[PDB]
Amino acid sequence: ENFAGGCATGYLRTADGRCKPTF
């Protein structure tokens, strides 16, 4: 699962129903 907080602050919203890395 996303790390560094998860999908919340830190990841962007991916249209694939998930969260990507905020570079």
Swiss-Prot record:
One GO location term (cellular component): extracellular space
Disulfide-bond pairs as recorded: 7-19
Entry keyword annotation includes Disulfide bond: yes
Tissues showing expression: Hemolymph.
Gene Ontology MF annotations: cytokine activity
Classification via InterPro entries: GBP_PSP
Acyltransferase recorded as keyword: no
Keyword vocabulary terms for this entry: Cytokine, Disulfide bond
Entry function: Causes rapid, rigid paralysis when injected into Lepidopteran larvae. The physiological role may be to reduce hemolymph loss following injury and promote wound healing.
Family: Belongs to the GBP/PSP1/paralytic peptide family.
Protein name (Swiss-Prot/TrEMBL): Paralytic peptide 1
Source organism per UniProt: Manduca sexta (Tobacco hawkmoth)
